[PDB]
Amino acid sequence: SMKIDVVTIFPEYLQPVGLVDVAVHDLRRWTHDVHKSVDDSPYGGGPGMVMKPTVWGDALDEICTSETLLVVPTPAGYPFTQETAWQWSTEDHLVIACGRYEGIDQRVADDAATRMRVREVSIGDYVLNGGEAAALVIIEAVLRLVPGVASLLEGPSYTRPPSWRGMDVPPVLLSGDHAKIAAWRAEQSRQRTIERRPDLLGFDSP
Amino acid sequence: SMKIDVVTIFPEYLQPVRQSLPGKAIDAGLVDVAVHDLRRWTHDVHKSVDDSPYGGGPGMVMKPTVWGDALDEICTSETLLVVPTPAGYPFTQETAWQWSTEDHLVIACGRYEGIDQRVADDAATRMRVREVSIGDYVLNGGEAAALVIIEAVLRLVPGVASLLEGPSYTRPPSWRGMDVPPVLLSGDHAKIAAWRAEQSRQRTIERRPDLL
Numbered sequence A: 001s002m003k004i005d006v007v008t009i010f011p012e013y014l015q016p017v018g019l020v021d022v023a024v025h026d027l028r029r030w031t032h033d034v035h036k037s038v039d040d041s042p043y044g045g046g047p048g049m050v051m052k053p054t055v056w057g058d059a060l061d062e063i064c065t066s067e068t069l070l071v072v073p074t075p076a077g078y079p080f081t082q083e084t085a086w087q088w089s090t091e092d093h094l095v096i097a098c099g100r101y102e103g104i105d106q107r108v109a110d111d112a113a114t115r116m117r118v119r120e121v122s123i124g125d126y127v128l129n130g131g132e133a134a135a136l137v138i139i140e141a142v143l144r145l146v147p148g149v150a151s152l153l154e155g156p157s158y159t160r161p162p163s164w165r166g167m168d169v170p171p172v173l174l175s176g177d178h179a180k181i182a183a184w185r186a187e188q189s190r191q192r193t194i195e196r197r198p199d200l201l202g203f204d205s206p
Numbered sequence B: 001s002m003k004i005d006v007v008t009i010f011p012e013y014l015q016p017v018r019q020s021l022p023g024k025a026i027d028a029g030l031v032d033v034a035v036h037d038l039r040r041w042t043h044d045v046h047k048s049v050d051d052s053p054y055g056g057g058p059g060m061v062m063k064p065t066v067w068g069d070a071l072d073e074i075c076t077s078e079t080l081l082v083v084p085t086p087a088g089y090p091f092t093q094e095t096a097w098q099w100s101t102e103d104h105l106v107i108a109c110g111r112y113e114g115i116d117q118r119v120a121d122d123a124a125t126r127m128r129v130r131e132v133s134i135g136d137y138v139l140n141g142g143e144a145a146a147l148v149i150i151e152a153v154l155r156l157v158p159g160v161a162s163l164l165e166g167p168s169y170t171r172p173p174s175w176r177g178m179d180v181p182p183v184l185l186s187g188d189h190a191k192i193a194a195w196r197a198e199q200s201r202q203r204t205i206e207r208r209p210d211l212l
């Protein structure tokens, strides 16, 4: 049993989303002007626009409680990893605040943290157009761990036919020897890990 | 100009990002994103795309025969074939920049427990293949990764660094007892730049020490 509220200026984006309820809210619902303005130019200068804290404050006041875990996707966040997904999988209430433009006024998260637990997180070292794709990633990774639903890369998998275009499934996998298969898979995992993610085994990255 | 083809058993998953393309980029022939249902290339009445893994284990593996036909039809020799996987090379902003100059990306989205390895191995004998991961967590399939990759790449296509970025602020100058840092209102633009650099350094130390 988990409730996830997603707040966004693009609710349509979240369409790809009884053990869990997922609600999507249009941030602009909490505006008061006819222009429904949620952004403004940054103090101190710079390109693009920043989301005003006022509208966010009103939205989160309505949706959050002191028990809420507020998740704020940002390229400057703490890394979201499998460990994080396991941790959040046992939470009662996630609220995901999706930014657009060049991000959200820092006081939204700072103020919220006086009232609830707040987690500014990055899903990877690349820049998205906004938090919505990150919300989908976080929701996917967490929900598959929810009850009722390691440091190595997985090796290759195969299925029928045993030969295809002159490419054979590795013979050990057809041998029925559970121990030999286990050993081979363990070796494949470690070789793939040293090739693709040597950092996971404590070596320098390329 | 770039064409992106996405192959998936859940084509509706990619409907958001297709819609989110500005008409001007499409009209200019700058970008085209097409989404294909993998089951179009199935061989049997049951439209089977998955089968049990050799060597045993849980879950199912996607059939090479179906994928082989799909990629045969969709790919050319100039294609960059992108295969999301939790066991992939890391997709980063450097990767996004590189792929932003490609003419044709094909993204093969797996489900179940992944795709028979011979699909990528065979494809790699006549095109460039990139098995990539978007982060150290496990998704249910490649579609969310495709969304991420498409967004990260396309925002680098015109008209479609070492440290973490610091905090941003806008009006009002005071909100819930919190003032915007006075330096940002100082009109001392060299000082502002130095303040922002220190915020960046501090945030990187706190959140991502690995980057230093």
Ligand SMILES: Nc1cc(-c2ccc3ccn(Cc4ccc(CN5CCCCC5)cc4)c3c2)n[nH]1
Residues within 6 Å of the ligand: A073, A074, A075, A076, A098, A099, A100, A101, A102, A103, A104, A121, A122, A123, A124, A125, A126, A127, A128, A129, A130, A131, A132, A134, B161, B165
């Ligand atoms: N892991 C991850 C999370 C996100 C994410 C999350 C939320 C929002 C809200 C808006 N954006 C787009 C954006 C954010 C910041 C900038 C400023 N920028 C700093 C980095 C270099 C370029 C200049 C520009 C555009 C977001 C991006 N991307 N990747």
Ligand SMILES: Nc1cc(-c2ccc3ccn(Cc4ccc(CN5CCCCC5)cc4)c3c2)n[nH]1
Residues within 6 Å of the ligand: A150, A154, B084, B085, B086, B087, B109, B110, B111, B112, B113, B114, B115, B132, B133, B134, B135, B136, B137, B138, B139, B140, B141, B142, B143, B145
């Ligand atoms: N960066 C990233 C990309 C993906 C991604 C991409 C494509 C597919 C296709 C299917 N899945 C789901 C899946 C794959 C493998 C396993 C088994 N595996 C063995 C032990 C270790 C834990 C997992 C389980 C489920 C995919 C997942 N997730 N995260």
